[PDB]
Design a protein around this ligand. Sequence first.
Ligand SMILES: *C(=O)CCCC[C@@H]1SC[C@@H]2NC(=O)N[C@@H]21
Ligand SMILES: [Mn+2]
Ligand SMILES: [Mn+2]
Ligand SMILES: [Mn+2]
Lengths: 84, 604, 604, 680
Amino acid sequence: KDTQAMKEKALKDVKGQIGAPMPGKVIDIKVVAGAKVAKGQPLCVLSAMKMETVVTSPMEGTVRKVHVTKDMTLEGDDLILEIE
Amino acid sequence: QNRAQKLLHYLGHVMVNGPTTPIPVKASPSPTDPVVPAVPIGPPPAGFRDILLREGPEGFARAVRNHPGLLLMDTTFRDAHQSLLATRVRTHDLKKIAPYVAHNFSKLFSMENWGGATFDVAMRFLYECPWRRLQELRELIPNIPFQMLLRGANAVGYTNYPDNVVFKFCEVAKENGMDVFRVFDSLNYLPNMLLGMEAAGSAGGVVEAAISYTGDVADPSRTKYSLQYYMGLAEELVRAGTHILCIKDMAGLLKPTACTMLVSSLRDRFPDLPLHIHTHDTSGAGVAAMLACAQAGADVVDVAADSMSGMTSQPSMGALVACTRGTPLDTEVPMERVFDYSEYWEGARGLYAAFDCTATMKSGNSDVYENEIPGGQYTNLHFQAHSMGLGSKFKEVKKAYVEANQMLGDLIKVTPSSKIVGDLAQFMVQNGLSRAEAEAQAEELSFPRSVVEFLQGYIGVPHGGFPEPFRSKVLKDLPRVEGRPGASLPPLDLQALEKELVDRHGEEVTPEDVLSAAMYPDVFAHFKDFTATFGPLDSLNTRLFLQGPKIAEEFEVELERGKTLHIKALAVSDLNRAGQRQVFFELNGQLRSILVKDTQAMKE
Amino acid sequence: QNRAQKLLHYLGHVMVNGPTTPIPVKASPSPTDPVVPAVPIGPPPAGFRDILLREGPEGFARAVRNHPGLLLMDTTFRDAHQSLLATRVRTHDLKKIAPYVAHNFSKLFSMENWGGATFDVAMRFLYECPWRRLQELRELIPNIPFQMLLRGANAVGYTNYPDNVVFKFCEVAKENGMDVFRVFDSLNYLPNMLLGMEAAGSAGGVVEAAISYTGDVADPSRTKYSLQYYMGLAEELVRAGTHILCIKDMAGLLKPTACTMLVSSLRDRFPDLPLHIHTHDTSGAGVAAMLACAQAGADVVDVAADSMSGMTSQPSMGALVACTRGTPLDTEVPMERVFDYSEYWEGARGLYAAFDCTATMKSGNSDVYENEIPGGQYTNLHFQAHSMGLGSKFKEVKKAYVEANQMLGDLIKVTPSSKIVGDLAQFMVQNGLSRAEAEAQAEELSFPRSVVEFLQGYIGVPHGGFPEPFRSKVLKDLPRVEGRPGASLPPLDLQALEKELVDRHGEEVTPEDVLSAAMYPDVFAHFKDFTATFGPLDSLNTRLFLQGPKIAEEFEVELERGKTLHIKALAVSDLNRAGQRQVFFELNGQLRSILVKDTQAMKE
Amino acid sequence: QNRAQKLLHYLGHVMVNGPTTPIPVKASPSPTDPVVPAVPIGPPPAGFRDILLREGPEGFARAVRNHPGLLLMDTTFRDAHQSLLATRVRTHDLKKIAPYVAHNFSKLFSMENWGGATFDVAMRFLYECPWRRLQELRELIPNIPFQMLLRGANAVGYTNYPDNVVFKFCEVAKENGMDVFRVFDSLNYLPNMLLGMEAAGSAGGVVEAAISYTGDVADPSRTKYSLQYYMGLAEELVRAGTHILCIKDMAGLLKPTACTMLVSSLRDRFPDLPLHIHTHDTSGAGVAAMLACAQAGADVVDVAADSMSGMTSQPSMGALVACTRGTPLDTEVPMERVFDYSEYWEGARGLYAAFDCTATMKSGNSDVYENEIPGGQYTNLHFQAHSMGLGSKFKEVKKAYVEANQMLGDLIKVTPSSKIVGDLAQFMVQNGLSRAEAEAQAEELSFPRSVVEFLQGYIGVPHGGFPEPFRSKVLKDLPRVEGRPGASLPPLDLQALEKELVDRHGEEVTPEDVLSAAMYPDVFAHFKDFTATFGPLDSLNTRLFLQGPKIAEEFEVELERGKTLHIKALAVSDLNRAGQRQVFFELNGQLRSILVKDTQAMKEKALKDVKGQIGAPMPGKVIDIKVVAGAKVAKGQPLCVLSAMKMETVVTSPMEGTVRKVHVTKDMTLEGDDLILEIE
Ligand SMILES: *C(=O)CCCC[C@@H]1SC[C@@H]2NC(=O)N[C@@H]21
Ligand SMILES: [Mn+2]
Ligand SMILES: [Mn+2]
Ligand SMILES: [Mn+2]
């Protein structure tokens, strides 16, 4: 673990998690941290090269926490949400 | 003291923060200057302007119809870069080759160098005055006629404005030295075209009514946009009085057999009416299609300099010239002349790497026949998918474009109809919606702005009507536009608007600025606002403009009004208290500095 | 695990030192995987090869003539990438869409997939056996005829070969799946193309004699490569007994009327003969030209997938399929399949960004009519000529490529003729010599090898001979040829090479290798040395082959079916005393590292 | 002001090329400035110089002798920093507390502030005039006597100078404010001392003859340098007519009993004679040894400011003052004053981090008892073994030093003799020669320059003699010096040297200068040439002098009698092709730029066209060498086979005749027009 460079974000990989498929700005705070997410519900909206994207879901259960803010730069896999 | 100051503050602001304008592809302006050929001193040879001003539009028209061999129009100064380089070409780079065109292309039917998106972006992304471009070119080319593209009822833009605005726009355009007005409407809505034609006509200057082309004429099993549709449309326009009739094929959907079928029929019906034809090369058949047009007896065809041609551009100027040597159809245009012209543009295009479509697009694509996306659009939507995405997200968008099209009634797709269908397309892919799913849920989905406005009547009436299964559900009784939008739309106070702009902008308001404000209220505000801070930027070369100078190289500024600034950029300091850097210049042998804020105290 | 140690060794070598082969344009292969369409199981539809196999070349010739409508050769597997991507396309990528081509293109006359520069480049740069490529695509495409480009006596090289080698080359090619041998000679020198013809005849392949085309047949004043010039040559080839006659337009010089002239006066001079017409699109007349050939009753035309066509390549297969619908000439190739094939090739094309000509060349150019530079060569000069000292004012290269033409007796510029003209101009570049300061300053100077060798008659006699006063002083006592190079050339001892190769380049070696080593003595040497060090890389993914793995990024590489290697690159160490870096990998969950040599840092 | 430009050209040269002086430790100065205690506005209290001026040296020595309690001489301004900070302390920093010492330290016997290493170090490294420093300090300290260290015949350099120049040195030194001349000779060699004494004598200053100390006088078994040895030597110097007598313990070798034994006995043979004892603290026995001297009745003791004491410097002032109170020895110096004096120096020291010996030396070392390296040498040799090399290679240097000392016949080691021993030690290690092995080979060894000059007697005759079987077969054919060197050395002109200084360095040349050029011909030359380019820099504060200004930092500077200069460094550009950088300053709010040269970037195959020579036709690898290197050629005959890729060029020649040399052999890539052959 790099403590020295733990002062950040996150890109949370393989297991059932929510990241950015497109590199863009963060616009939305749709779901509450701890709210019911049944069907394929929108959660987040990105904006790139004159574009806008709707962040998918196909996952059942409850949201852990939002990691994104507003007007946030997003890098790669990144940290939008977390479902269990 | 301010003038070179604002100029050094601009050049400084670039060096420290980078281009002030959006840089879509992350590449740098080419380091090698464009080769301008030698040009004879004195007057250019007789053109067609020498016959227009004297004999009048109807005489010009006659001379054109009588000219045995094939005539051409150069689109390099407009439609060409509007498709290949995002309309970014600046007045500076246009002027450098204007003299060469006057002296060597006297034989051109006309020269498209204005209208379409040039007006819009010159002010939005270039901070050049679109009118200044017009007059300065006009002063450098007396002999060849100037053609512009007029979006029928709305002049320049994508939304119908009051009728006086269009009628005055043309008056002024003509007085500033525009000759041929190519007038079209996205829907082929005859009332919207007539509006344009009248505004152009009554302003003096040649009226070229442009029929927008969709479908395939040589395919009889397609009945909506059939030969009998276009004939009849063309009937109505000729009856309404055209100087030159144009077939406008914005998407490159015009095949050879479909050509000679249509051109033969227009020649059938009107033996002595000048036919001007325009295509794009997206399908890879442009040259063949124009040669088929020429042979069926069309008078004029459009081309761009080889090095600014192909793909979503016009067919190669050289190809058209070459293929008619030793033919009754001969262009009589000397090939050396096209070589040197094309080689100028090879250099100029170089300067515009940041906007070059060949970042993503390496060739044309015959699938236009399926998707019907116009050249210009194809480039933008292509870039949007390949650039940020993973390549094959484009297949989905255009197969949703196809659906949006027949969803909205099977439309003719030019500006703004293509924006409308494209806006419906990108809507259906933000939410994984079938044509069948989306129109079964048409009642509530709350579609985008331009779609609801289209379905209301804001751009007029499509041939065939509106899709009434689908459209009523979207609208939930909103105020649908009755007749032609123009008349039922009170006139805009040009007098009032004059004074309105003055109390903040000043006494330095020419009547041209007014029409600019009338067309684009906001981007003209932001244009002057920028010009207020940095001065007129259209005198610099494009490398300097786009990327600023580089440390240690002396360069002279072609600053107008007869005074030359010698500048050598020396050094930028590192950041201070107030998150800025200090830029060091030599200015006419004097040591000078200014402060520019680094946008990094802006980033945390 | 020792076959995998070598793989790791290669992947480290790329990671440390950049790509092994010269990469001209400093760009990366795209991160997007090319889209391959789904294909139905079981056999493909029956193609022309079934008529060939069951009826011999004689029947195939007849069947092609009897097919009323226009037949096509897809050229994407060879010429298209030789022109646009410096012949770099690896087998891996060809093999992928091969099942698709098999199932969806049975209607093709043939597919060009071998010979030309692909032989040299495959071994020299791609470290692949070209014989493998042929056999492996053969197993995947049983129904479409394969087509080669053989340089006559020049074979797949740059100078003339002993008869026994050229003959033997065609035999084993036949036995590896070669169906059609397209035969041409750079100088149109009759005896030389008669050699390659019988050597192709003996093998039992379809013999396609090709007249190389220079000049303008439609131009009366050009009294060197006249309409009658070609007519004379054709009569001889038909009388020599070719199965199919081809016109090879290497530089894209055919204009629509020049086609109409030549193919009609050929059809009307040999009613029974299949006419195969080949062109490049560098001038932008390619489609129109080819459509004129079809109209004048050409049996077959050459095209390339849309995304691999245009500019210096072949004409769009989309366009000829499209422009031919609803016409006697209908190709009957479905448009939806043309889209898919092209779409795959866009994906593939991106993997080759570093070799893509469009980084410097953004369009075709009409000035081929001036510089007569062939498709392939118009790429390999400012994109290339990087090896000899880059490009710097390329205009001057060309304007002396034009002088070089007249300088060597005004020639048919193909391979290896054009190479010799392309070695003389580059020579004049770095030595800064004008044509006037060369014809006289001839004896007191030393030109390249290719020039000296051509002048003494190594690759044949040009039409009208050499330009004597110049020819004399270059050669100065050097021995001249005596007629047909092959005639007076001693046969190469192929059995003594056999035992050499076995004693040297590994033990058990194939007869194909003998023919590689014959064609290219030490390009084969360097190739066998490489694979011995690094193993067989043809199995490897292209992005993987060209730039290596992404650090931390897990991937799969199956060393040809059988086994699955899950690999992940981990880190690269600092430099050790011996100038090496250690490189760490995960191999099937197991930690593995190698010692590689850092080129840059190795100079002690 | 062309001399504002000269200031800037220097400041720019620093911040482009880094610390312009040799910078031994990779460290920068403190971002803090020394605390100067508040001072009274009037004239200072009357000190000893008032007595000296009124009574002469003979009177002054009486006043010293009669003072009941102990008198101190502060060495912070000279010896302290010579040991601790490679003598690097500049006039600027000394001037700052000059007013403070004047007012608060009137009781001091004298105040060592000149001579020894300061003379060349000022010019050689600090680029300032040592006379200017003396002069300026004299206007600042009217009341305390000044003291210098004078190396007898070697005056202020490292060998014997012509008689006349040594006398004239003392005259102009005296004339400048120099009161007390401490006069020693590295070998306690009387003639050289008498010379030094009558140089200072006839110049009018207080003469302090100084016996150099080695061995252990308390140790009966060590006969060579006995209490008798030293006793016989003082008696000579007293006969010669000294004012004060000094014991110079340069290595810190003096322990309590030995002091008690020596000073008490010197008090016996000379009842009322002022005894001035000087030691170094490098064995850790400095304070104690001095208290012993106090008790045995010494009149003056040498100390340094606390923050400049311990280790190889003098003993702590604070300690002697503290351990002396409430006794007849009492210095009567208030502790508050000592604290404050030291606190300034704690801060000043901080500026000299680049030169602080403490970077590798954190303690004294009792092994001085075995090796006997004087204070200054110890630390300026210890550094040499932990800095440019690492660690224990100093051990062997010390082991060789011990051996070298006895090789040269057991010597009193001070400058220059100590330098000699250290030069022979370095030599023996520099090529692995053990003592006995060096002895046998000395016949043809070729030793250092200073060692062979010594054995000729350029520096004189040591007590005992020259270790004989050695001396003879080193020199073998070289002139020796009999007796005193200065005796044969012709009186050096000082007016034909004046003419040259008028020539090389313009008209405005003082006589002070003359003696410097006499002392250090080449150091003075390099000195005067620096102050030509960059002007006088003795006015900058030390952080600015050594390190340059920080970017954006707004700072103040005055140039000797000229008004204030507000300055800001703004930026320093990239490199132009000439290898220069442009440096931008805000001068007086006005923007100014300077071109300066980048040293670090100053240290940054042939073609022949229009001649009979032959250049390569294309850029290519050489696969064949055809013509034998220098042989005949014919009409159009192949010479070289070149190959880039797919392109080859068989190199021909119409030029006939002989061939010169062959340039390239085999392999590596050759450029476009590159070197192949000449033909006659
Ligand atoms: C070398 O690496 C491959 C040869 C590339 C040159 C090609 S071969 C075919 C074209 N004709 C010619 O003379 N040069 C082009
Ligand atoms: Mn258009
Ligand atoms: Mn070809
Ligand atoms: Mn001392």
